[PDB]
């Protein structure tokens, strides 16, 4: 690969030069002969695999604190190396853990919210041993992050993987999600995305209310044990009913959503250590709710019902009745959150902030990996600045990774 | 390996084998994806490229290894020897052009690929000849509003010093003017080309939607200006079916999108002049042409007429005015019986086309970044469709703007 790669913004004509890509650690799944940029996803580590990965990260850490090659650096390397030799693993210091978490976010090419990366509250839950404790740590996370509507981003990090048979896992895909129930007649009640997880919860003993917006219980696995159910205290679950500034009837749709998006099934990888349970949270971009959660056909799918109430001509697509309904729904979402003083960002502000963030990263870091397919918002793409912005995608570590759903791999005790 | 692609709405999984046939690079590597980057001869090189194309041509007509296949190959080799190049048969030219369209990863309109009217203009020698072929193209393709897809193919490149080039980026475009106050009148995307035409002697009406003259270069010579006969230029006045004030905006557009600056590559041969046309997807005009910042940039004016709250962005006033503009464009063209397609119909057709290509061809190269429409993305099926992108030949390639290469 060449040392410099340039990206252009076709709207402002700004050219940026990327050197950071040289530090790319893993495969994209693309090759010289095929691109996989629209593909969704294109037994532990050994001693000898782990030494270079740890050293890679420790060097990076001491470089960031302007202490590279120092006595402390060399001593840290020595300590880590001896630990790997005598335990087949090592323990990050609190500083390294915080650094690592923040940089995994900073490195998330698909995240448009990264201007905020350095402001992340890191909760160290490496002393956890049980599922009740995981629940305690998660309740505190939710309360702190929610902050009565003034949301603050956070992550809670559970003990790293050891032999792979003692993994800590949050089985929920987010800490807060709505149940989906498949009906005998083929119809789905609730959120069709969560039908499987809902069924698993019901099997472990959850008594479902069988409603449209039932907050799911936490299903938590500690130390490789069977997972346990806990109900989140409802006072900790901030929710927003959806209404519209102009349409009085919109409240009658009975919509609501939760304030706190909190992804809980990703793997955090730092210096070759694997944190299989690392629930993190920030706040919502409106389109995630107004376009995807609400208007996807395999989701709540409300376009038709909203369109009917708007009295739109729904017999021609070329009337763009879908597009019209889609805008209003996204207005109602933003209006509802702002009126209830719950943090949310519209897709224009967010993309504009990201362009600023990306430019700053090119200047101070030599680049900023970004996945245009994910960064561009699901509606009104070209009237946001990121549509016009060339991006380079590559994988830096520390990183957040996907992992198999735990029910697919768990050995029941 | 065989690769799978999934649609996340329908869970339909298709299997790609076609990608194994490509030999041109994408610009990506194992370590860096460049899917959002806009742009990532000798006898010696010439024959195998020619040989490959003949092979696939004769393999497509179920006569691979035939006497004619063998003879044609001999014929082509002997010709590259004795002339440093070769000439495509009519049949091959038509097949080549349809397949460049078919292999065009960014085109959402490819379900139409095999219905392409091919005009062979390889006997052209002068810019006057070019003008005549182009007038015939425009007239045939416009067809009183019932548009028909077409391509006109001018002589292939020889030495680079005798290129045929259409200097216009599209046969029909509007002028853009730099005003004394630093603002732009008309289409800002065309300000450079407009000044080149003015320098050449074109008398500008200096209005908002002035049809630019053709600038035609034959055989490496200086380009010549030509006025398209007005009666051949179909235009649509944009009005809204509910907002009776929308016509007051004075917006119009042309019916015929006819891209004229690309390069058609067939069997190693280079056609630097190959203007082609189909018809519009509404968003091209209603989202990009009208609402881009660097273009007509009408969003603000429209939202004012809609009396929207424009003090905060979270009112989505931009998004509202955008949908209304695009409704107007679709309504206007349809009311005037001018062929057009909305982005829901077009993306649906594409998903169907993809399925056809996987079934009969083992794949379909597709550029998600380009296929997904610039508005209402995830409420169209292509957003949720995984795609594989790879470069197959024959193809349409970009080429440098001719005013950067030409010595006068
Ligand atoms: C603070 C406000 C934040 C905003 C506005 C934001 C915005 C977004 C959005 C809109 C996506 C696309 C996801 C989708 O469409 O489903 C995304 C992806 C992602 N974000 Fe952020 N985010 C924020 C905070 C965070 C934080 C705190 C972290 C981790 C510490 C994070 C890590 C990620 C990762 C790893 C992805 C990729 C998800 C995937 O591949 O499935 N984000 N972000
Ligand atoms: C018949 C109706 C057609 C429709 C509705 C259609 C639609 C589109 C659209 C919306 C684009 C994106 C272009 C942009 O946003 O600037 C595109 C790209 C493209 N189309 Fe089609 N198209 C049609 C016909 C054709 C024909 C007849 C050809 C050639 C014979 C063709 C070849 C291409 C190529 C090469 C591109 C990529 C150009 C680039 O990379 O800049 N299309 N098409
Ligand atoms: N099928 C499927 C399928 C669809 C989406 C995803 C990824 C969803 N991740 C969403 C996500 C992740 C992190 C976020 C951080 C902040 C925020 N506001 N939203 C965030 C949203 C995976 C599988
Ligand atoms: N700067 C810039 C810049 C902007 C756009 C493009 C690509 C333009 N291609 C437009 C294009 C090409 C072929 C088409 C075929 C049919 C159709 N309806 N539209 C079509 C539109 C290149 C450079
Ligand atoms: C097929 C395609 O890769 C898939 O639908 C992607 C497209 N871009 C996305 N972008 C975001 N932000 N979130 C998503 O879930 C997706 N889905
Ligand atoms: C940077 C990015 O590749 C560029 O803006 C592309 C994005 N996708 C596009 N898609 C279409 N259909 N047309 C375009 O001009 C572009 N522009
Ligand atoms: Zn790629």
UniProtKB/Swiss-Prot annotation, chain A:
Major place of residence: membrane
GO biological process, one term: regulation of cardiac muscle contraction
PTM characteristics: Ubiquitinated; mediated by STUB1/CHIP in the presence of Hsp70 and Hsp40 (in vitro).
Positions bound to L-arginine: 174, 283-284, 288
Domain of life: Eukaryota
Chain residues that bind heme b: 111, 402
Keywords: Calmodulin-binding, Cell membrane, Cell projection, FAD, Flavoprotein, FMN, Heme, Iron, Membrane, Metal-binding, NADP, Oxidoreductase, Phosphoprotein, Synapse, Ubl conjugation
Chain positions recorded as (6R)-L-erythro-5,6,7,8-tetrahydrobiopterin binding sites: 38, 373-374, 387
Any single Gene Ontology cellular-component annotation: caveola
Tissue: Isoform 1 is ubiquitously expressed: detected in skeletal muscle and brain, also in testis, lung and kidney, and at low levels in heart, adrenal gland and retina. Not detected in the platelets. Isoform 3 is expressed only in testis. Isoform 4 is detected in testis, skeletal muscle, lung, and kidney, at low levels in the brain, but not in the heart and adrenal gland.
An MF annotation (GO) of this entry: arginine binding
Cell compartments where the protein resides: Cell membrane, Sarcolemma; Cell projection, Dendritic spine
Domain notes: The PDZ domain participates in protein-protein interaction, and is responsible for targeting nNos to synaptic membranes. Mediates interaction with VAC14.
Function: Produces nitric oxide (NO) which is a messenger molecule with diverse functions throughout the body. In the brain and peripheral nervous system, NO displays many properties of a neurotransmitter. Probably has nitrosylase activity and mediates cysteine S-nitrosylation of cytoplasmic target proteins such SRR.
Family: Belongs to the NOS family.
Subunit structure: Homodimer. Interacts with DLG4; the interaction possibly being prevented by the association between NOS1 and CAPON. Forms a ternary complex with CAPON and RASD1. Forms a ternary complex with CAPON and SYN1. Interacts with ZDHHC23. Interacts with NOSIP; which may impair its synaptic location. Interacts with HTR4. Interacts with SLC6A4. Interacts with VAC14. Interacts (via N-terminal domain) with DLG4 (via N-terminal tandem pair of PDZ domains). Interacts with SLC6A4.
Official protein name in the record: Nitric oxide synthase 1
First and last residues shown, out of full length: 302 to 722 of 1434
